Amino acid sequence: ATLVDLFSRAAMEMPDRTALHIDDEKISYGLLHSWAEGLADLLHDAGVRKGDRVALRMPPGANAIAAMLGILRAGAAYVPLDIRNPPARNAFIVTDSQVVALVGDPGYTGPLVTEENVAALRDRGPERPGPQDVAYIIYTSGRPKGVPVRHGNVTALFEACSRLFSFSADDRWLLFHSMAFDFSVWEIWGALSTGAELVVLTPVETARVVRDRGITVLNQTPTAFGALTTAVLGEGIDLPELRYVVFGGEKLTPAVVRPWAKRFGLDRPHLINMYGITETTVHATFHRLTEDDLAAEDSVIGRPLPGFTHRIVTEDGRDAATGEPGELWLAGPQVSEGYLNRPELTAERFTTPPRYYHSGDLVSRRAGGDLVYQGRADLQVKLRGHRIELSDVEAAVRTHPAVVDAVVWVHEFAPGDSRLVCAYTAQPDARALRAHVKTVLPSYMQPSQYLALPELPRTINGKADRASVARAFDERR
Hints:
ATP binds at residues 140, 145, 249, 273-274, 276, 278, 361, 376, 463. By secondary structure, the chain is of the alpha/beta class.
């Protein structure tokens, strides 16, 4: 019912198994459970009561996971502040989430449990959260908003994934993502609710430990996976232990999957695409990739998870016919109650008797029931009497061999001067690229300007940060 209940079961029944594995160092379920229960006692002393929220700012590692379990155990919601947060953003989130304490290192004036404080309780009750209680509050961005996910939302996710995956205490999960990215929730509680192991951390170097630590459940975004596949193919690394690669973050194209699939096939490991949004607890669909998916260029996300009811809605509120694009609507136990302190948005994104969340994503239902991601509604744009699929522009640029990644957008140069711009990453001058794109796109879809970048700035979820790339562009033009 709760996540502290999930960790309870696993710690009680398998206390000798390795919970955390950091380098050559190991922490057992029983000791983690003991450490975390001590932390909760600490927090409660500091006045942390049930239903409060606590900021967590720590480098990934044992103290961070212990801190996090501590916070949950005290009955509180944890608010992760990513180390990559500039000071203004941290201050905003802490103020906006109304946190009553912080755990970690401040870069604030409230109650401070340091890291040192956390580290001490290792070698060393309060009331327990319920399913309606908030587990975490994660921020998506641009004005950043908080999504508060409840214990019932998260345990609903793992009950939903129950018979889709075959997980056991024998697995080894890698913790690869920031605790401010909710993909990390799935990583942490994938292992911790099954008795499994959680390995806590160059692509080459990352690839080395995936074999060396015998990772069986790997979670990646498409950008990270391409860099991983290049290192793996390059060194000749083999990963006999790997059972599942699971894909979150940006839309997955067959193109990033094909080289891997050439080397390893699709039988072992299983390649699984999961469409997800923060507002519906990490994951919302499941598709196991097949040779079919590599024959075409469609981004199949498969079928929504078992607890979900859904609709594909037209612009004027109807159910979309088959092959007809539409906005995906999602109802169910994984759907959050709404935003934090965004009563307006919550009003329009969540509507009620299923209560639906409006993804703002376009999808089509194939025959047989499979969903196919078409794109974001917000990225369908009107320019000079034309309607432009920014996503389609991004793909055409991407089809250049020397181009890794690309983001295109409408940029306001002057009050009457709005034009398409593209930023891209190489693995190639704009001239050669310009020449190629004239071949692929009609003139009204061709970017007016090209910006070569070392790497695209991305959100915490790893989706391309449009507001930042625009600002980067304005500054060097």
